[PDB]
Design a protein around this ligand. Structure first.
Ligand SMILES: [Ca+2]
Length: 268
């Protein structure tokens, strides 16, 4: 673990109350995030041992995700370097809250959503403002550019952001920083396809590739437009390739790999 400076305490700190943390520490408990001098602190009055400090200097990305009718509002921190987290470690920490006469009932559901969205949005801007000489901006998922896919087991929506491609609605969290990407390869694209798979190769060849599987064919051209828009070069093929073999070969002699034309072998 990379060493982190002590949090410097701040008058009363800006606060977001009644908030849960993911990944979860003991039992899941409601908590409280406070903005301080050089970072933020999470803690709960119901688990009085717990404390999670994150410095502005260790925040690579800050995301605000309003209720996209998954009945959850999220503020997400993608960290530069992982930090100790109970007896484990994490590179992502997020704070969330879930939603908990028909005319007036819907009035109230609407009010509750707007309330949570306002509280979380406001706090997110306060974090960016307080950590602004570290250059922090609030980034947000782009709803109309989202597409379905399976990066783990369950079908989830993956959203492009200004700098990233994320899935933070449910664990395991995915935050791909686009500038880290070397190449993308589209698998099982063939006449009559129902869905296809997307593979990300990173500029660091020791980093494992990321599979986003089972993307509906309705989203095939949209993903390509996304890749082009992100200046990520790509290829496509009918087969699922063995990336263990490929990345093993590449990491052994990357200089010869690029003298041989690099990822062009994926392009016929
Ligand atoms: Ca409703």
């Amino acid at each position: 673990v990379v060493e982190q400076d002590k949090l410097i305490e701040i008058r009363r700190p800006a606060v977001l109350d009644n908030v849960y943390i993911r990944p979860a520490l003991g039992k899941r408990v409601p908590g409280k995030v406070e903005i301080h001098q050089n970072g933020i602190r999470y803690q709960s009055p119901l688990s009085t041992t717990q404390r999670v400090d994150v410095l502005f200097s260790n925040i690579r990305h800050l995301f605000f995700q309003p209720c996209q009718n998954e009945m959850i509002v999220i503020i997400h921190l993608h960290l530069k370097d992982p930090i100790l987290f109970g007896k484990k470690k994490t590179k992502d920490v997020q704070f969330y809250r879930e939603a908990i006469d028909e005319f007036e009932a819907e009035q109230e559901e609407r009010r509750r959503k707007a309330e949570l969205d306002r509280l979380f949005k406001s706090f997110a801007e306060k974090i960016a403002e307080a950590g602004r000489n570290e250059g922090i901006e609030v980034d947000m998922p782009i709803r109309d550019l989202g597409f379905n896919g399976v990066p783990n087991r369950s079908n989830v929506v993956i959203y492009p952001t200004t700098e990233c491609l994320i899935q933070i609605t449910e664990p395991p969290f995915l935050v791909i920083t686009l500038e880290d990407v070397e190449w993308a390869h589209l698998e099982r694209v063939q006449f009559g396809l129902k869905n296809f798979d997307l593979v990300f190769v990173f500029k660091d060849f020791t980093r494992p590739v990321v599979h986003i599987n089972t993307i509906p064919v309705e989203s095939l051209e949209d993903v390509k437009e996304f890749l082009d828009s992100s200046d990520i070069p790509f290829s496509e093929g009918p087969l699922n390739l063995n990336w263990s073999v490929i990345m093993k070969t590449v990491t052994a002699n990357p200089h010869q790999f690029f003298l041989d034309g690099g990822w062009g072998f994926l392009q016929n």
